[PDB]
Design a protein around this ligand. Structure first.
Ligand SMILES: CNc1nc2c(CCNCC3CCCCC3)c3nc(N)[nH]c(=O)c3cc2[nH]1
Ligand SMILES: CNc1nc2c(CCNCC3CCCCC3)c3nc(N)[nH]c(=O)c3cc2[nH]1
Ligand SMILES: [Cl-]
Ligand SMILES: [Cl-]
Ligand SMILES: [Zn+2]
Ligand SMILES: [Zn+2]
Lengths: 356, 356
């Protein structure tokens, strides 16, 4: 019988690690890419707390048996805490020390309760994703509030027996791009104690060079023996560089969003399949990809379907993109385990950026 | 080695028949539902001559290896002759005895050549689908032109060795709702000689009662020993009643169109899955359906996906609808073979129209 939560590192190369998270509903191989569940293999998928709390509502999801039953997925599910999406998507918001009001209220306690009603396995603390750019004062005030909310999240989670005994709780580091604030945030989170630690507040417009610079000093501040989750990242090259900096877990809408917008990921970089240059291209989307789409259909046919407005085209693109992301993660895990990840990262970038 | 074309009737009940068409690329069980190939099991799929001749063009499809290679489908493909869709979809049309000009030209010879370049297995004669309603004079003139075009189609097909030796050609009966014109058309087509015979000019706004009345006298005019194809039909109850009147083959965009618009077919009638009454319905789309969607997901989840704008929702609906149509055809074939089709049709209508 698997434990509630146990992270084991099987191999390391530089700052990169590969290993497993064991939870009651399954094993998660790391570094992991965690796709959105409504996309269409992955070891864990993401639910959408913000959407679900509005439609059909968390109480209704619980009445229907929880998100595992609802979605037909019996393996682990991660949910975000909802505030990032409230601040990005809601029409109007009112923030206070209690939480955020929007047009519904979200507080640390209500976020944890919603995630309990959804039945997710990995629960995120309720935080504030500081906008970018931020002044040091504003980043500090925001981070300090997030740390108070992290403690409230911890307490709310621990009060719900079924959740405390069967799920896991991750804290989210904030502090914008400021090393001293990232350190204070890491210290506060470690004092509270979490099952895993996310790097929040990145992929918010700062660009890859700055994101990597912040990761360079921020990831080592987190406990080494627990998973490190970079929220909202990212493109394939973002993922590779983040793994080189000690990240174990990723989520991003990009493979699914790109698939619905004509973009396919390949080892030679992204391609826009709608472009006329693919109308007679008999090669698969990627000539090394092992996915079911690339085993059967050509770029020319997928181009044709997309240009015709056929939903099948976008679904084939999405299936390929999700599978490409999983193959990327598998190659990352294998190369770290074999001590050739540095070489893999160099080879990957040389080919991905050549765009051949 | 299968023949170019051989239709065998295994069992009959009233006017209904069940049997098989053998062709080089496979066996087609009849009565057959023939879905569009770009939809997502069927024994034959439809290509889209009208679309393909415009994008990417028939010559380009041939350069890519033909429609079987292009679509990844090695079994039989039927193509229509393109004029029905030209008259329904084209912005402007100019008709003459030579053919139709539109904004490209289509004639019997060019239609057959396009279908040859696409590589389809069942080729339709190039006809004129008479608008409804039509006066007797207009229906007669139109039918007479279609019969001259049927002879030109026959000759063009016979001139192309690869096509004549490996594909089959169906003639299309016209004559609107007029028994004498339907008879003249059947006589003309039988004198030319075709591998199968379609009933054209129906499902054009006349409604089911009138369509069935025309089928009552029109199907017996066709050769009994060859397949009978009702073009563009239809809803499940249309199909059942048409089989009761001697039809062997059907095509319709309805299962695919309905799937992209929130409508699912069930043995209790169609349902609009977007309706709020399905938001908490844990039953599958249909509680007897054996499709992969109904084995795994609830109405509530599919409702959720569709309402969220997720492409996955429409694809699950389409997969279910296509599978439902195939299960309908299987039940039809089994019931005719077992001598219980009359009872099946009665039971089907009682439950389908009760809408429970
Ligand atoms: C895209 N950039 C980005 N995303 C961040 C996210 C959200 C991660 N993705 C969530 C999924 C989105 C699709 C639906 C399901 C949930 C962040 N979330 C939190 N709580 N805090 C961040 O600082 C935080 C920071 C993030 N940066
Ligand atoms: C919907 N009603 C209807 N359709 C008819 C059709 C078209 C059948 N469906 C073709 C497919 C449509 C989707 C794309 C692939 C081809 C008819 N075609 C011809 N040639 N003649 C008819 O009298 C004729 C009559 C028809 N009546
Ligand atoms: Cl969320
Ligand atoms: Cl057509
Ligand atoms: Zn692929
Ligand atoms: Zn089904």
């Amino acid at each position: 019988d698997r434990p509630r939560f146990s992270f084991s590192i099987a191999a390391r190369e530089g700052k990169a690690r590969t290993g497993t998270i064991e939870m009651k509903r399954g094993v998660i191989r790391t570094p992991a890419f965690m796709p959105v569940g409504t996309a269409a293999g992955a070891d864990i998928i993401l639910g959408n707390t913000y959407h679900l709390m509005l439609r059909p509502g968390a109480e209704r999801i619980a009445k229907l048996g929880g998100l595992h039953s609802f979605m037909g997925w019996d393996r682990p599910i991660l949910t975000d805490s909802g505030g990032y999406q409230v601040m990005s998507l809601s029409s109007l918001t009112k923030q206070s020390e209690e939480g955020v009001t929007f047009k519904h209220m979200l507080s640390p306690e209500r976020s944890i309760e919603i995630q309990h009603l959804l039945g997710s396995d990995i629960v995120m603390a309720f935080d504030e994703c500081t906008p970018y750019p931020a002044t040091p004062s504003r980043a500090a005030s925001s981070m300090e509030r997030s740390m108070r909310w992290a403690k409230r999240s911890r307490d709310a989670f621990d009060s719900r027996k079924e959740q405390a005994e069967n799920a896991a709780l991750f804290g989210i580091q904030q502090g914008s791009v400021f090393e001293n604030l990232r350190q204070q945030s890491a210290d506060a989170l470690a004092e509270i104690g979490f099952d895993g630690y996310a790097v929040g507040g990145l992929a918010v417009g700062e660009g890859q060079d700055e994101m990597f610079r912040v990761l360079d000093f921020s990831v080592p501040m987190l406990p080494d023996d627990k998973p490190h989750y970079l929220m909202g990242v990212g493109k394939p090259d973002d993922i590779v560089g983040a793994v080189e900096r000690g990240i174990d877990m990723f989520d991003c809408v990009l493979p699914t969003r790109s698939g619905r917008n004509g973009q396919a990921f390949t080892w030679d970089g992204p391609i826009n399949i709608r472009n006329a240059r693919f109308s007679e291209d008999l090669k698969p989307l990627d000539s090394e990809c092992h996915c079911a789409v690339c085993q059967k259909w050509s770029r020319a046919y997928i181009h044709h379907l997309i240009r015709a407005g056929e939903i099948l085209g976008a679904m084939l693109m999405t299936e390929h993109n999700i599978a490409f992301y999983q193959q990327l993660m598998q190659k990352i895990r294998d190369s770290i385990s074999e001590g050739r990840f540095s070489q893999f990262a160099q080879d990957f970038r040389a080919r991905y950026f050549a765009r051949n």
